[PDB]
Amino acid sequence: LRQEDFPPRIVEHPSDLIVSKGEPATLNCKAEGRPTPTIEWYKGGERVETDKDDPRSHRMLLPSGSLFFLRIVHGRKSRPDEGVYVCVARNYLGEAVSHDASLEVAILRDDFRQNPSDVMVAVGEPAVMECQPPRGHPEPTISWKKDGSPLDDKDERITIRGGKLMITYTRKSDAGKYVCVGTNMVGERESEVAELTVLERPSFVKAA
């Protein structure tokens, strides 16, 4: 047995990650060298600031070389965590750079861009309701509920298209409470209840 000295070598590379805003996240990376290479991380070719640079920071450089995020920060006016990462190991002999890992963030807001509205329709005519759900990543898919049950378009007179719900050949049983639901991997969001009133011609002339 002896002692030695050698240029930096990466054994474990970071892996692509999908995490939601506010969750903790780890990007793994472990090196070998003699020293004892100082580890560094780069997002889109900028040094990542951690608890060794600023002691208040939400990121920690773990002794293992993994980058650990106390919480993924990601909002309207700042998203400083998502992006493409590389760990770089170094001593006086050399340098090892790892493969790219992308940190992608899943988010769903609470602000509905537009709630559906009460609508009044006359029996036999078509009715239209409108929804645009909050922003999201990925963008949420839109379903609807009537009177508390999911709504479905295996039923021939119900069409769901983009933002709009359309019921054709209205009858009295369509009158109810309609809510619009936007959903992605992070969760679901519910709109304000809109109310459909369906009236006979005579009292449609009266109300309208």
Q: Minimal distance in Å, beta carbon 160 to Hg ion?
A: 19
Taking CB atoms, the residue at the shortest distance from Hg ion is 148
Question: Of 34-42, 105-113, 140-148, 158-166, which part binds Hg ion (CB under 5 A)?
Answer: 140-148
Q: Tell whether residue 150 is a contact of Hg ion (CB under 5 A).
A: no
Which residue lies nearer to Hg ion by CB, 148 or 162? Answer: 148
Report the residue from 63, 148, 150, 202 that binds Hg ion according to the rule CB under 5 A: 148
Count the helix, strand and coil residues of the chain and give each as a percent rounded to the nearest 5: 5, 50, 45
Which residue lies nearer to Hg ion by CB, 179 or 186? Answer: 179
Handedness of CA 189, 190, 191, 192 (dihedral sign): negative
Q: Minimal distance in Å, beta carbon 119 to Hg ion?
A: 17
Which residue lies nearer to Hg ion by CB, 181 or 186? Answer: 181
C-alpha distances (whole Å) from 161 to each of 108, 157, 168, 188 are 21, 13, 14, 19
State the virtual CA torsion across 142, 147, 148, 153 in degrees, nearest 10. -40
3-state secondary structure of 70: coil
Query: Could you list the residues that contact Hg ion (CB under 5 A)?
Result: 148, 177
